[PDB]
Amino acid sequence: TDFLKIELIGRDGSHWVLSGPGMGQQGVTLNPNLQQFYDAPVKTLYVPGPFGEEYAGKRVQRREIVFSVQAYDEDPDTWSTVDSLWRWAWDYDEESELRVSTSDGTRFLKVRLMEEPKPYYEKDPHITADNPIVMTVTATFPYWQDEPEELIWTTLSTEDMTRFPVRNDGDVPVWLKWTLTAPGLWILPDFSWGNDMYSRGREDLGRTVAMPELVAGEHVSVDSDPRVQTLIAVNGMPTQNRWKGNDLLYPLMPGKGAEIPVQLKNAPEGGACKLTRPRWYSRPWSRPGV
Amino acid sequence: TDFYTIKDAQADLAIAPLNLTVLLAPYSTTPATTLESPTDGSLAIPPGYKSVGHFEKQAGLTLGNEFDSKDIEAYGEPEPIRTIINKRTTTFDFAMYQNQRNVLELIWTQDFSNIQPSEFGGIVLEAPKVPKNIYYRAILVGMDDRNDRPIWLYWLMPKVKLDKLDNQTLNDDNVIEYKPTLKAFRDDVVGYSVAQGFAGPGWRDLVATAGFGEALTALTITPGSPTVTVATGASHTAQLLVEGDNGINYTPDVVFTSSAPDKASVSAAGLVTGVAAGSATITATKGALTATATVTVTA
Amino acid sequence: TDFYTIKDAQADLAIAPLNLTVLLAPYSTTPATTLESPTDGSLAIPPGYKSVGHFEKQAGLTLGNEFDSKDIEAYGEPEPIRTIINKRTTTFDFAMYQNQRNVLELIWTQDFSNIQPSEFGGIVLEAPKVPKNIYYRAILVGMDDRNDRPIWLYWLMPKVKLDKLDNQTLNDDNVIEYKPTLKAFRDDVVGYSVAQGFAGPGWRDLVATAGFGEALTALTITPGSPTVTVATGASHTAQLLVEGDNGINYTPDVVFTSSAPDKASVSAAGLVTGVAAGSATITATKGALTATATVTVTA
Structure with missing residues (x-):
């Protein structure tokens, strides 16, 4: 349909249109009945309680998308070429992009081959030259993504301050990344946004964290997500070692945003700060909510 | 353009199999590639093909085509985008009258070449212990006689097997007929299971109109x-x-x-x-x- | 008000396909958007569409519409509140008489453009080793001539495929007829699978009564x-x-x-x-x- 368009960018950069306008131009179409494709799988925890079991929290699970494609052509030789290209568009170690385009925009999922594909019918595929491949791909990161928003602030003054406009339009919290140049003393926001995961939702509403003083050449990446270490110096110096039991604890809660303040001091040659904010969604398409 | 010119229908392209015959050959016989004599374009049957003689008129000869199909469904499309014809099975059936050796061999799935008539000509044909899977070569050639310029339209089946045999009823007013169904298989040597061909002076007249080659x-x-x-x-x-x-x-x-x-x-x-x-x-x-x-x- | 006025029936709106023809074109041919000539409103068939010739009168041409439906039922309602037509499948079948190349190509799912007649005109049409999935473009145009003011009513199917083929019976008193069934698929370039159209001076008379546009x-x-x-x-x-x-x-x-x-x-x-x-x-x-x-x- 023209209301929905599904594309694949392979590990090798090949572009396939599986459904929507222009589907099957590269020879591969998408078969019906694809599972765990729309909603992010979440399991909710329950613990014994007086009236049965009490809610204890939720855990998002990785996506296990089982779908099927159909590789077709008029002649078996070109069909074999198309099937080989489709297989080359996938891998186990490295991931490939699966984009969904609707009136709500374009959102992509990074997926990899969970297991070996199951191709062809019971007989040799060169007879029909039109054969289905059963794909079992997995999304380690289960959230559909749009391109993250990047903001740059460069200053020449020794001491300066800026207000980064930040807003979470998605339905799930997101973790911010900072790229800070050196030398200089940086103060970055760690606002709770009302999140009470550390019993300090109101205490940390306007929380700011001071990074250790950076020496020349010690440019840092400060990623708040739990997957990555918070502080990484580009030159390999242990910058986190001088930071005294302190961390960025709070993601950007959905529906919240403000002008977060970033302060720079003691910078003889100024400095640059880059803020990267991901746009994470649990569905391939959804109307904006607030 | 008027409707008649758009339709451009030709009645001469309607061919009626006025007289038809079926010829069976052992699987060792070289298959018939064509029924047109190279020297003069006459009806030429290769050696080894023997006619099954007369067969029933009301029953006629029935050619059956069976298609195995599979629809391909698209996620973004409600109707099937494509259909695949996995295979095409060809059969033909008819009701033979005569009681000759090749007819009886086909009916009983046995080779009666070693059957020796008794002192007074009597023969006994025993059905085999286990039915024997025997293949034959079939030529189904019919002739339409039009203005003394016959059209021979024929089917070549390089490999046929007895698929089924219907029940035969004995009636004191009707001769005994054997009505077999023969299924065509693909022959590896010739590369096809069924072929259809035309020949004769009438077809020489009508080939340009039919649209094979170029007009004379x-x-x-x-x-x-x-x-x-x-x-x-x-x-x-x-x-x-x-x-x-x-x-x-x-x-x-x-x-x-x-x-x-x-x-x-x-x-x-x-x-x-x-x-x-x-x-x-x-x-x-x-x-x-x-x-x-x-x-x-x-x- | 009396039923004559309330019914307001117009027998003139009943159209009888007095003479009908079927035109088939290769899938590479540009689809026919309309059959009305932009110059004088006459019947215009696009190049590449070739008629199949005569077909059996008694069988006629049968158009089959098949609906796949799904009933939507509510918890608080006994009957199904809604129904959904997932798809509509359109087919048409008819019994061709003529033995021309496009007819035989459709029957055998093969391209016979390279078939060279022999020295005496004979041709042999072997069936493909694997059946070939070939698509055509179909124009089913019929004409009702009333008072010398014809009405051409037509069905345009930009994508048709041989779905099934009926059994052929060879009878010494009847010509050989090929009875195919053709299924219509949706063509992406034109956006539809089947369309129905009317044209002609009689239709120009009947447009206002039929209720398309406004009355003259x-x-x-x-x-x-x-x-x-x-x-x-x-x-x-x-x-x-x-x-x-x-x-x-x-x-x-x-x-x-x-x-x-x-x-x-x-x-x-x-x-x-x-x-x-x-x-x-x-x-x-x-x-x-x-x-x-x-x-x-x-x-």
């Missing part, structure tokens, strides 16, 4: 300067070929005439015989098309 | 002051157009007359030729409606 517009001739001898010998007669622009020999269809019969006497088939020395003109006509050839005659 | 109530004409020349040249003749308020050209339906033939002589088609200088009145009438134009003629 030019009537070329064999080299138009032949030398012939009055005296009897090797060169006392010469044969002339009349061909179309589409690589079809129209010698039987054209009419041979000689403007100077004294020099070269022309036969209907296209043989010019030297009679008196000099030069002669030979003309073959077909509708609007005409031919000309100058023949030299030497004493 | 005002008979407008091309600008009513055309300048024409007595002497032969570019401006010695002028063409007049007669249109309705619903944007339909009624020039063939109206009757062209000239009150002063000496000045401008009017033809049936609507061409006024300058004969003598002055002014002329040209009137085109249709029932109660009329249109008039004052033509100037210069020597």
Whole structure:
């Protein structure tokens, strides 16, 4: 349909249109009945309680998308070429992009081959030259993504301050990344946004964290997500070692945003700060909510 | 453009199998690639094919095509985008009357070549311990006689097997008939399971209209300067070929005439015989098309 | 109100396909968007569409529509609240008589453009080793000629495929007929699988009654002051157009007359030729409606 368009960018950069306008131009179409494709799988925890079991929290699970494609052509030789290209568009170690385009925009999922594909019918595929491949791909990161928003602030003054406009339009919290140049003393926001995961939702509403003083050449990446270490110096110096039991604890809660303040001091040659904010969604398409 | 011109229907392209026959051959027989004789385009049956004789009229011969199909569904489309024909099964059935050896062998799935008649001619045909899977080669050739220009339309099945045999009822007013169904398989040597072909002077007339090849517009001739001898010998007669622009020999269809019969006497088939020395003109006509050839005659 | 008025039935809106034909084209042929010629509204068949010829009268042509449906039921409602038509499958079948190349190609799912007739015209059409999935473009156009004003009603199917083939019975009193069933698929380039259309002078009469557009109530004409020349040249003749308020050209339906033939002589088609200088009145009438134009003629 023209209301929905599904594309694949392979590990090798090949572009396939599986459904929507222009589907099957590269020879591969998408078969019906694809599972765990729309909603992010979440399991909710329950613990014994007086009236049965009490809610204890939720855990998002990785996506296990089982779908099927159909590789077709008029002649078996070109069909074999198309099937080989489709297989080359996938891998186990490295991931490939699966984009969904609707009136709500374009959102992509990074997926990899969970297991070996199951191709062809019971007989040799060169007879029909039109054969289905059963794909079992997995999304380690289960959230559909749009391109993250990047903001740059460069200053020449020794001491300066800026207000980064930040807003979470998605339905799930997101973790911010900072790229800070050196030398200089940086103060970055760690606002709770009302999140009470550390019993300090109101205490940390306007929380700011001071990074250790950076020496020349010690440019840092400060990623708040739990997957990555918070502080990484580009030159390999242990910058986190001088930071005294302190961390960025709070993601950007959905529906919240403000002008977060970033302060720079003691910078003889100024400095640059880059803020990267991901746009994470649990569905391939959804109307904006607030 | 009016409806009749748009329709451009031809009744002559309707072919009625007025007289049909089925010929069976053992699987060792070389398959029939074509039923058209290379020398003169007549009905030529390869050796080893033997007719099954008469068969029932009301039942006729029934050809059956069975398609196994599979629809392909698209996620973004409600209807099936494509269909795949996995296979095409061809069968044919008919009700033979005669009680001859090949008919009985086909019916009983046995080879009765070693059956020796008793002292008074009686024979006994025992059914095999286990049914035998025997393959034959089939030619189903029918003739439509139109204006003494027959059209032979035929089916070639290089590999047929007895698939089923219907119940036969004995009635004191009807002869005993055997009605088998024969299923066609693909022969590896010839690369096909069933073929359909046409032949005959009527089909030679109708091939251009049917649309195979190109329409006959030019009537070329064999080299138009032949030398012939009055005296009897090797060169006392010469044969002339009349061909179309589409690589079809129209010698039987054209009419041979000689403007100077004294020099070269022309036969209907296209043989010019030297009679008196000099030069002669030979003309073959077909509708609007005409031919000309100058023949030299030497004493 | 009486049932005559309330029913308001029009027998003229009943169209009988008195003569029908089926045209097949290769999938590479440009699809037919309409069968009405933009010049004069006559029947225009796009190039590449070839008729299949005669087909059996008794069988006719059968159009099959199959609906796949799903009932939507509510918890608080006994009957299904809704129903959803997931898809509609369209097929059509008919029994061809002629033995021409496009017919045989459709029957055998093979391309026979490279089949060369033998020296005597014989051809052999082997079935493909694997059945080939070939798509065609179909025009099923029928004509109902009433009062010499034909109605051409047609079905355009840009993508058709051989779904199944009926069994052939060879009878010594009947011609060989090929009875295919063709399924229609949605063509992405044109956006539909099947379309139905009407054309012809009879349909031009019946458009308003059928209820498409608006009824003809005002008979407008091309600008009513055309300048024409007595002497032969570019401006010695002028063409007049007669249109309705619903944007339909009624020039063939109206009757062209000239009150002063000496000045401008009017033809049936609507061409006024300058004969003598002055002014002329040209009137085109249709029932109660009329249109008039004052033509100037210069020597």
